[PDB]
Structure 1
Amino acid sequence: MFLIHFVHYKTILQKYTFKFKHIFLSIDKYNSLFFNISGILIWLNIIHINIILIKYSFFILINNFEYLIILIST
């Protein structure tokens, strides 16, 4: 049987907070250094030279992977 009617109290207090970052916050990416490219030499069958900006070049990259490329003051 039923003796009474009542209002249903609850303690909903969240007072502790636990967040755990998902695994993909720490996953790797590829980052690069970025300079203004002063010029480019490409060679595979036929050598072709672009020149964007003419200055004494402080730095030079060489990359052989398919086409030979030289990135000047890259």
Structure 2
Amino acid sequence: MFLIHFVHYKTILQKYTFKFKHIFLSIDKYNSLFFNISGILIWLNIIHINIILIKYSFFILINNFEYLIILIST
């Protein structure tokens, strides 16, 4: 049988834990060629992208290493 109704005197507090993205750090340190570009024309067989900034005279570099890449005035 049950005689008494008793509660425990020690009160516990639930620790609220949560994972938030509070820090925003990134290691931006690469080894690559970066160009001044007055025009870039990316021709792969699916998608062609033509981006043109105007000038009086241009030059042409062409890269066929992965996909056709045409650069105007380097």
Instruction: Report the CA distance between 1:44 and its aligned residue.
Output: 1.3
Instruction: Report the CA distance between 1:52 and its aligned residue.
Output: 4.5
TM-score after normalising by structure 2 = 0.44
Change (3 A) 1:29 1:13: farther
Structure 1 consecutive aligned stretches of length 4 or more whose deviation exceeds 3 Å: 1-35
Residue identity over aligned pairs, in percent, reads: 100
Q: Contact between 1:37 and 1:52, CA under 8 Å: does it hold in 2?
A: no
Instruction: Report the CA distance between 1:8 and its aligned residue.
Output: 75
Q: Which consecutive residues of structure 2, in runs of 5 or more, have no partner in the other structure? A: none
Change (3 A) 1:4 1:39: same
Aligned partner of 2:73 in structure 1 is 73
Q: Which consecutive residues of structure 1, in runs of 5 or more, have no partner in the other structure? A: none
Aligned length: 74
TM-score after normalising by structure 1 = 0.44
The root-mean-square deviation of aligned C-alpha atoms, in Å, is 7.6
Instruction: Report the CA distance between 1:34 and its aligned residue.
Output: 6.5
Instruction: Report the CA distance between 1:65 and its aligned residue.
Output: 0.7
